[PDB]
Structure 1
Amino acid sequence: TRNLIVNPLLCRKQVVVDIYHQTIVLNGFVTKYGGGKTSGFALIYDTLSALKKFVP
Protein backbone atom coordinates (compact mmCIF):
# COMPACT_ATOMS: atom_id res chain seq x y z
CA THR A 1 0.00 0.00 0.00
CA ARG A 2 1.19 3.51 -0.95
CA ASN A 3 5.01 3.18 -1.20
CA LEU A 4 6.85 -0.07 -0.48
CA ILE A 5 10.61 -0.21 0.11
CA VAL A 6 12.51 -3.51 0.11
CA ASN A 7 15.23 -3.59 2.77
CA PRO A 8 17.49 -6.66 2.55
CA LEU A 9 20.11 -5.33 4.96
CA LEU A 10 17.52 -4.96 7.71
CA CYS A 11 15.58 -7.97 6.31
CA ARG A 12 12.33 -6.01 6.25
CA LYS A 13 9.88 -4.20 3.98
CA GLN A 14 8.79 -0.60 4.57
CA VAL A 15 5.21 -0.13 3.36
CA VAL A 16 2.77 2.68 4.15
CA VAL A 17 -0.45 0.89 5.06
CA ASP A 18 -3.62 2.86 4.29
CA ILE A 19 -6.78 1.84 6.14
CA TYR A 20 -9.72 3.09 4.06
CA HIS A 21 -12.42 2.72 6.70
CA GLN A 22 4.85 -11.63 16.01
CA THR A 23 6.82 -10.76 12.88
CA ILE A 24 5.22 -7.38 12.08
CA VAL A 25 5.67 -3.84 13.38
CA LEU A 26 2.59 -1.63 13.77
CA ASN A 27 3.46 1.97 14.63
CA GLY A 28 3.16 5.51 13.34
CA PHE A 29 -0.60 5.78 12.86
CA VAL A 30 -2.55 9.04 12.66
CA THR A 31 -6.21 9.17 11.60
CA LYS A 32 -8.22 12.06 10.16
CA TYR A 33 -10.74 14.36 11.81
CA GLY A 34 -13.68 12.49 13.30
CA GLY A 35 -12.29 9.07 12.45
CA GLY A 36 -12.68 7.42 9.07
CA LYS A 37 -9.55 6.91 6.98
CA THR A 38 -6.35 6.10 8.87
CA SER A 39 -2.80 5.80 7.56
CA GLY A 40 0.30 4.19 9.01
CA PHE A 41 3.55 2.38 8.37
CA ALA A 42 3.76 -1.41 8.27
CA LEU A 43 7.09 -3.14 8.90
CA ILE A 44 7.51 -6.88 8.37
CA TYR A 45 10.60 -8.62 9.76
CA ASP A 46 9.85 -12.12 8.36
CA THR A 47 12.18 -14.06 10.66
CA LEU A 48 11.32 -13.97 14.36
CA SER A 49 15.05 -13.57 14.99
CA ALA A 50 14.83 -10.16 13.33
CA LEU A 51 12.11 -9.10 15.76
CA LYS A 52 14.27 -10.75 18.42
CA LYS A 53 17.28 -8.58 17.53
CA PHE A 54 16.29 -5.75 15.16
CA VAL A 55 14.17 -3.82 17.66
CA PRO A 56 15.37 -0.79 19.72
Structure 2
Amino acid sequence: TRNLIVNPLLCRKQVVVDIYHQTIVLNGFVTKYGGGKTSGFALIYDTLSALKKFVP
Protein backbone atom coordinates (compact mmCIF):
# COMPACT_ATOMS: atom_id res chain seq x y z
CA THR A 1 0.00 0.00 0.00
CA ARG A 2 1.27 3.44 -1.03
CA ASN A 3 5.04 3.22 -0.50
CA LEU A 4 7.49 0.80 1.11
CA ILE A 5 10.64 1.72 3.02
CA VAL A 6 12.78 -1.30 3.90
CA ASN A 7 14.70 -0.18 6.98
CA PRO A 8 16.98 -2.94 8.30
CA LEU A 9 18.98 -0.38 10.29
CA LEU A 10 15.96 0.07 12.56
CA CYS A 11 14.76 -3.48 11.76
CA ARG A 12 11.53 -2.01 10.49
CA LYS A 13 9.06 -1.77 7.63
CA GLN A 14 6.86 1.32 7.31
CA VAL A 15 3.80 1.90 5.12
CA VAL A 16 1.17 4.58 4.63
CA VAL A 17 -2.09 2.83 5.49
CA ASP A 18 -4.88 3.90 3.12
CA ILE A 19 -8.24 2.64 4.42
CA TYR A 20 -10.89 2.90 1.70
CA HIS A 21 -13.93 2.53 3.95
CA GLN A 22 2.03 -7.04 19.07
CA THR A 23 4.50 -6.34 16.25
CA ILE A 24 1.89 -3.92 14.84
CA VAL A 25 2.11 -0.26 15.86
CA LEU A 26 -0.32 2.22 14.31
CA ASN A 27 0.13 5.98 14.53
CA GLY A 28 -1.17 9.14 12.89
CA PHE A 29 -4.56 7.87 11.72
CA VAL A 30 -7.19 10.38 10.65
CA THR A 31 -10.22 10.08 8.42
CA LYS A 32 -11.28 12.38 5.62
CA TYR A 33 -14.10 14.82 6.31
CA GLY A 34 -17.52 13.44 5.50
CA GLY A 35 -16.65 9.88 6.49
CA GLY A 36 -15.43 7.29 4.03
CA LYS A 37 -11.69 7.47 3.38
CA THR A 38 -9.37 7.02 6.37
CA SER A 39 -5.59 7.36 6.20
CA GLY A 40 -2.70 6.49 8.47
CA PHE A 41 0.86 5.27 8.86
CA ALA A 42 1.88 1.79 10.00
CA LEU A 43 4.93 0.43 11.82
CA ILE A 44 6.13 -3.12 11.04
CA TYR A 45 8.55 -3.88 13.88
CA ASP A 46 8.88 -7.57 12.81
CA THR A 47 10.81 -9.48 15.51
CA LEU A 48 9.67 -8.72 19.06
CA SER A 49 13.25 -7.81 19.98
CA ALA A 50 13.24 -4.54 18.07
CA LEU A 51 9.84 -3.75 19.53
CA LYS A 52 11.08 -2.82 23.03
CA LYS A 53 14.56 -1.92 21.86
CA PHE A 54 13.46 0.49 19.11
CA VAL A 55 10.18 1.62 20.71
CA PRO A 56 9.51 4.54 23.12
Deviations 1:1-56 (A, max 9, x none): 11111000000111101000000110111111122111111110111111121112
Q: Distance in 2 between matches of 1:51 and 1:35?
A: 33
Matched, 1:9 2:9: yes
Q: Distance in 2 between matches of 1:30 and 1:14?
A: 17
Uncovered stretches (5+) of structure 1, i.e. residues with no partner: none
Q: Among the aligned pairs, what percent are the same residue?
A: 100
| TM-score for both structures, normalised by structure 2 | 0.91
Aligned CA RMSD, in angstroms, stands at: 0.8
Length, aligned pairs only: 56
